[PDB]
Amino acid sequence: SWFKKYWHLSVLVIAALISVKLRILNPWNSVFTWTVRLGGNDPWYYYRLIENTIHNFPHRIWFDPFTYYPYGSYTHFGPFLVYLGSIAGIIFSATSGESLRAVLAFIPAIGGVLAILPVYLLTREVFDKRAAVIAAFLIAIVPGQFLQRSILGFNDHHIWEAFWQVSALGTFLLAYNRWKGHDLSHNLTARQMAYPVIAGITIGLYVLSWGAGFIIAPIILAFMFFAFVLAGFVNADRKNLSLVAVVTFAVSALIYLPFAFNYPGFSTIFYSPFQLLVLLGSAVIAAAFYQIEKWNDVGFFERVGLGRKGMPLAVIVLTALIMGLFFVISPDFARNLLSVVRVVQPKGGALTIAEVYPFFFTHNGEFTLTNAVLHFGALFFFGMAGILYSAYRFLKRRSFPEMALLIWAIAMFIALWGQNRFAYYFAAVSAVYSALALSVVFDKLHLYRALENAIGARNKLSYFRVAFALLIALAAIYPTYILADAQSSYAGGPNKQWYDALTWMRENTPDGEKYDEYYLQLYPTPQSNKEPFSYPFETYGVISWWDYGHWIEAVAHRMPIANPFQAGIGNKYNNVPGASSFFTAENESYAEFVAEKLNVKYVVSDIEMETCKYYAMAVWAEGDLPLAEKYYGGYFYYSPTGTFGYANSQWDIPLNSIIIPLRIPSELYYSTMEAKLHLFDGSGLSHYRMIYESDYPAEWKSYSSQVNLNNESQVLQTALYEAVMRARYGVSPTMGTQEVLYKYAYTQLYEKKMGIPVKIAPSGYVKIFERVKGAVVTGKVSANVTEVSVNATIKTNQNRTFEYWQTVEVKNGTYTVVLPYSHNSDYPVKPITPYHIKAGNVVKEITIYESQVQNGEIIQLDLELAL
Amino acid sequence: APYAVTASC
Ligand SMILES: C/C(=C/CC/C(C)=C\CC/C(C)=C\CC/C(C)=C\CC[C@H](C)CCOP(=O)(O)O)CC/C=C(/C)CC/C=C(/C)CC/C=C(/C)CC/C=C(/C)CCC[C@@H](C)CCC[C@@H](C)CCCC(C)C
Ligand SMILES: CCCCCC/C=C\CCCCCC(=O)OC[C@H](O)CO
Ligand SMILES: CCCCCC/C=C\CCCCCC(=O)OC[C@H](O)CO
Ligand SMILES: CCCCCC/C=C\CCCCCC(=O)OC[C@H](O)CO
Ligand SMILES: CCCCCC/C=C\CCCCCC(=O)OC[C@H](O)CO
Ligand SMILES: [Mn+2]
């Protein structure tokens, strides 16, 4: 037929269409809903940078005073993705808002499809032409962090890391292949010079997408180092390999130069002159390898008298010297050697991040190959066989590209071991080496013959071997696509309760029009951010867990205290004010210390921070992880007697009982700010009032069609019914049920000792509080009382109501309470009763103006009897 | 889906 020299493009097109179905069509209904949902968190910060860059085109900010309030943080996100989305938005006339997000959602998907090309190139320039076709197909179905970070809506720079790293290695090894065996006058032609120039541009674009992309230079230097010290071992045109590297690194340094001075110091992620020195310094190291080979060529190592081994040895001594004599700038070493800390994380606080946890390990510290299936499918094991075979073949053929690919493979495996995120780097590794595996078997099992016997050839073809070549193609491709089809059917991002709450914040908190204007200003790059930023108008901060910082800035257009850059977390052990030391504050006086230092005016708390994410906040605040279970106790159990019990230790739980897989928090938890805010609805606090709460968790919103959420008994039976139903399958109860179970445990363990109850009802997913000076209600009191209590009923915008209590002790025959709610406020969460203030046997009722709450007015209210 | 967020929820 016509597929002659042309099937290889027929598979690439089919591979691209499979990639489109997984990346664009599968998560389509998850990205395009009630709004355009960019996935995760970081795609929302790129969206922030892009609509600012579009407004100030062609200029770009390198420091953001919005996030990390009130200090601002330097922007490490690369100019590649920022300028790509910015130009893409202008071409489609989408400069902000939902229309801009719809354009940005396709960029990660297109990068995932386009990755077929650099994977083909790298595989062809190392192995053969058939294997490059398998690798292109396999990279179209590999799941895990590669597929999820290249899906529709996940406009992050991780796909462009993988795209440009593989592009750099392919173009570099293509340049070495086009240059080897030729003299310099031939390699100096424009046709030959184009190959290392292209390789240098791909390296520059790699760094321009990721400040830590300079790591490609020591990897390429590792190619030359091992090719030199093994001159009799490996067979490589070392002189032309050195010259390709010189041109490649010089061009890359020129590409990086115009972006090199946007950080006031050396940095490995921020766009600083450190990366410029790594690229420029790599060019002179490659130029030093030029002399060592030019000296070995003439025979300089035998005239001095060291032997053929001398040339390897002088490389080793200079590898030690040329680094040792680079003490001319010790900050360079400190940042260069800093890479070894990247794959290690004894921080513990950092461990609580979902993307950083080490591969091959459970949250119990035991080896596992379970993520290898969930992230690569069969390609991992098919990839190891291709790696081991490549090592076997390298020891026989001694091809240099096969050696460099192995070095790349082993370096990416160490990074994969460190953090599970770097699976987006190892994805192209298993796809390339499984292609090497499947290509070996397809030739030895006569499938390459039967394919050409199918049209226009004659071969001795064993259908028994062909049937098995088809059967292991099954095993490599089918279970891999199964996981990719499932994982691509949903996309992450904020839920409606988070989005609705944040849009409400943007339109119902003061200065929304000033924040909107300041959101698009081209901020100057400061020399330091250790002092609070000098804002052009009176700003305020919004404190929450660091997960939601980008959502706060991009959706609410408000300045968050903490962000997904793990900035603004703070801790308690050092009294560093931040998110953790605020939400784990054990009394309101300490939380006011943290809030005042950070100029906090608003608090956003969700049910996640209340339940399953509270453990991380105690880990950050305390630093030590075993020092964090102090906030936790035992478990609930459904015993064979048909009753529900509670035990401190697992041994106290009776046999045949059914253990709700939910660790009930300790008494210390219920005294912290997160409990007082979300689980007690702000009761007991004098400087905070609830102003807005979102809808319920979806499960309980569904439950309310047949459950009376004003009936504590009906809620309790429903929560206990669900918890057992899901404990039967070893699954935790839903979040809305975890909150109800948390409230039930407080009433059965720590309530009777105090007298302040909590309604067993559920509540809204996201809750917003405003920081208040507070109306000071002070007055005289009778002769023999030591305590004064305040009572008021609050009703939220979801028609849910709760009690606000506060108790103070009498001193000098006088009480003083500070009240955060008012009775003429504009907020959708209002009190429906006056304040009932009790002083022993004397009761009085008071209503408070909003002006007295804002300005902290003192009100005299005596509760005294003669007696 | 593990991304730049707190885990186990
Ligand atoms: C050892 C390696 C480890 C890599 C993995 C790792 C520990 C870290 C990298 C992880 C990674 C992918 C990225 C981290 C980058 C950084 C700094 C930060 C990232 C922050 C975060 C991820 C991003 C946050 O932002 P977000 O993305 O969330 O928005 C590298 C590969 C090199 C090898 C020699 C391994 C080969 C394997 C084997 C089995 C043989 C070993 C045998 C041996 C006998 C040992 C051999 C010993 C040697 C020293 C030879 C090395 C040669 C060469 C490199 C030296 C030349 C000059 C160098 C110094 C650079 C010069 C630069 C300047 C000065 C010009
Ligand atoms: C290289 C850059 C790629 C640019 C591609 C952008 C082109 C078209 C985007 C529009 C896709 C349709 C989305 C849609 O149905 O919107 C309807 C409601 O917004 C649903 O929320
Ligand atoms: C002298 C060096 C100056 C370098 C200036 C580069 C600055 C920003 C790079 C972003 C521009 C987009 C590049 C582009 O469209 O090509 C990439 C694929 O072809 C399309 O996905
Ligand atoms: C062919 C060569 C195969 C090499 C296989 C090595 C596998 C894993 C190496 C990663 C070690 C990283 C450091 C580590 O274990 O933990 C560091 C703590 O954080 C120290 O506190
Ligand atoms: C009433 C007497 C008690 C004294 C303790 C003070 C406690 C809290 C005062 C907080 C005042 C709110 C100010 C705020 O959050 O924003 C600061 C920007 O001016 C924007 O409002
Ligand atoms: Mn990210």
Smallest Cα–Cα separation from A556: which of A600, A495, A503?
A: A503
Q: Using CB atoms, which residue from B3, B4, B6 is nearest to A616? A: B6
Ligand 1 contact, A323 CB (< 6 A): yes
Is A616 an 8 Å CB contact of chain B? yes
Note whether B7 contacts A354, CB cutoff 8 Å. yes
User: A306-339 in b/e burial notation, b at 16+ Cβ within 10 A?
Assistant: eeeebbbebbeebbeeeeeeeeeeeebeebbeee
Q: Using CB atoms, which residue from B1, B4, B9 is nearest to A613? A: B9
Residue type, A68: Y
Question: What one-character-per-residue DSSP string does A420-487 give?
Answer: GGGHHHHHHHHHHHHHHHHHHHHHHTTHHHHHHHTSS------HHHHHHHHHHHHHHHHHHHHHHHHH
CA distance A99 to chain B (A): 24
Q: Using CB atoms, which residue from B5, B6, B8 is nearest to A40? A: B5
DSSP lists the bridge partners of residue A791 as: A805, A836
Residues 6+ apart with CB under 8 A from A53: A59, A60, A61, A82, A83, A86
3-state secondary structure (DSSP) of residue A650: helix
Ligand 1, atom 11, residue with closest C-alpha: A415
- What residues in B contact A363, CB-CB < 8 Å? 8
Residue A158, annotated as binding a ligand: yes
Please tell me the distance from the alpha carbon of residue A508 to that of residue A829, in angstroms, as a whole number: 13
**Looking at residue A491, what DSSP letter applies?**
-
Give yes or no for a contact between A616 and A352, defined as CB atoms under 8 angstroms apart: yes
CA angle A541, A545, A548 (to 5 degrees): 80
Joined tokens for residue A595:
């809030």
Annotated domain spans of chain A: 1-493, 494-634+666-696+764-773, 635-665+697-763, 774-862
- How far from A728 is each of A352, A497, A642, A649, A848, CA to CA, in Å? 27, 29, 15, 20, 51
| Residue keyed to tokens 């013959």 | A449
Residue A157, annotated as binding a ligand: yes
Q: Using CB atoms, which residue from A357, A492, A735 is nearest to B3? A: A492
Note whether A421 contacts B6, CB cutoff 8 Å. no
A204 CA to centre of ligand 3 in angstroms: 10
H or E element, residue A708: none
Resolution of this deposited model, Å: 2.7
Is A355 an 8 Å CB contact of chain B? yes
3-state secondary structure (DSSP) of residue A298: helix
CA distance A43 to chain B (A): 10
**Looking at residue A267, what DSSP letter applies?**
-
A414 CA to centre of ligand 4 in angstroms: 7
Note whether A564 contacts B9, CB cutoff 8 Å. no
Smallest Cα–Cα separation from A855: which of A772, A768, A771, A769?
A: A772
Supply the Cα-derived Rg of chain B in whole angstroms.
Answer: 6
- What residues in B contact A547, CB-CB < 8 Å? 5-6
For ligand 6, a single-atom ion, which residues have Cβ within 5 Å?
A 42, 156; B 4
User: A150-176 in b/e burial notation, b at 16+ Cβ within 10 A?
Assistant: bbbbbbbbbbbbbbbbbbbbbbbbbbb
A541-543 vs A600-606, strand pairing mode? parallel
Query: Phi and psi at residue A190, in whole multiples of 5°?
Result: -65, -40
Experimental approach was: X-ray
Ligand 1 contact, A471 CB (< 6 A): no
Residue A182, annotated as binding a ligand: no
Give yes or no for a contact between A832 and A801, defined as CB atoms under 8 angstroms apart: yes
Ligand 4 contact, A343 CB (< 6 A): yes
Which of A31, A45, A351, A355 has the most B C-beta neighbours within 10 Å, making it the best mutation to test the interface with B? A355
Task: Tally the residues of chain B.
Answer: 9
- How far from A694 is each of A141, A704, A828, CA to CA, in Å? 39, 15, 11
A333 alpha carbon, closest ligand: 1
Is A41 an 8 Å CB contact of chain B? yes
Residue A76, annotated as binding a ligand: yes
Give yes or no for a contact between A523 and A48, defined as CB atoms under 8 angstroms apart: no
Joined tokens for residue A475:
């095993």
Joined tokens for residue A163:
């795209």
Q: Count Cβ atoms below 10 Å from residue A555 Cβ, excluding itself.
A: 22
- What residues in B contact A41, CB-CB < 8 Å? 3-5
Alpha helices in A599-642 (DSSP H): 607-610, 614-622
Whether omega for the bond prior to residue A70 falls within 30 degrees of 0, making it cis, is yes
CA A539, A543, A548, A549: dihedral to nearest 10 degrees?
40
Task: Tally the residues of chain A.
Answer: 867
Please tell me the distance from the alpha carbon of residue A533 to that of residue A530, in angstroms, as a whole number: 9
DSSP lists the bridge partners of residue A838 as: A789, A843
CB-count burial class (<10 Å; 0-12, 13-18, 19+) for A807: middle
CA distance B9 to chain A (A): 6
Ligand 3 pocket by C-beta < 6 Å: which residues?
A: A 79-80, 83-84, 208, 254-255, 258
* Half-sphere exposure of residue A616: CA atoms within 13 angstroms, side-chain side: 23
The 3-state secondary structure of A518-556, one letter per residue: HCCCCCCCCCCCCCCCCCCCCCCEEECCHHHHHHHHHHH
CA distance B1 to chain A (A): 7
Smallest Cα–Cα separation from A68: which of A499, A501, A493, A542?
A: A542
H or E element, residue A130: helix A129-138
Smallest Cα–Cα separation from A209: which of A78, A88, A45?
A: A78
Ligand 4 contact, A341 CB (< 6 A): no
A444 CA to centre of ligand 5 in angstroms: 77
Question: What one-character-per-residue DSSP string does A140-206 give?
Answer: TT--HHHHHTTSTT---SHHHHHHHHHHHHHHHHHHHHHHTT--HHHHTSHHHHHHHHHHHHHHHHH
Is A282 an 8 Å CB contact of chain B? no
**Looking at residue A807, what DSSP letter applies?**
E
Query: Phi and psi at residue A676, in whole multiples of 5°?
Result: -60, -30
Residue type, A244: V
| Residue keyed to tokens 């010089």 | A250
- What residues in B contact A613, CB-CB < 8 Å? 6, 9
Give yes or no for a contact between A558 and A506, defined as CB atoms under 8 angstroms apart: yes
CA distance A377 to chain B (A): 16
- The shares of helix, strand and coil residues in chain A, as percent rounded to the nearest 5, are 55, 10, 35
Is A161 an 8 Å CB contact of chain B? no
Give yes or no for a contact between A832 and A795, defined as CB atoms under 8 angstroms apart: yes
Ligand 1 contact, A253 CB (< 6 A): no
Please tell me the distance from the alpha carbon of residue A64 to that of residue A74, in angstroms, as a whole number: 6
A109 CA to centre of ligand 2 in angstroms: 12
DSSP lists the bridge partners of residue A805 as: A791
Give yes or no for a contact between A427 and A142, defined as CB atoms under 8 angstroms apart: yes
Joined tokens for residue A346:
């004894």
Ligand 1 contact, A296 CB (< 6 A): no
Is A374 an 8 Å CB contact of chain B? no
Note whether B5 contacts A41, CB cutoff 8 Å. yes
**Gap positions in chain A, given as the residue before each gap (C–N > 2.5 A)?**
none
User: A29-62 in b/e burial notation, b at 16+ Cβ within 10 A?
Assistant: ebbbeebbbbbbbbbbbbbbbbbbbbeeeeebbb
Give yes or no for a contact between A687 and A818, defined as CB atoms under 8 angstroms apart: yes
| Residue keyed to tokens 């977390």 | A569
Joined tokens for residue A141:
């179905």
The residue to mutate among A103, A163, A496, A499, having the most atoms of ligand 2 within 8 angstroms of its beta carbon, is A103
Would you tell me which residues 1-9 of chain B have a C-beta closer than 8 angstroms to some C-beta of chain A? 1-9
Joined tokens for residue A529:
């951010």
Ligand 5 contact, A599 CB (< 6 A): yes
Q: Is A843 left (phi over 0), alpha (psi -120 to 50) or beta?
A: beta
Q: Count Cβ atoms below 10 Å from residue A596 Cβ, excluding itself.
A: 12
Ligand 5 contact, A771 CB (< 6 A): yes
Ligand 1 contact, A410 CB (< 6 A): yes
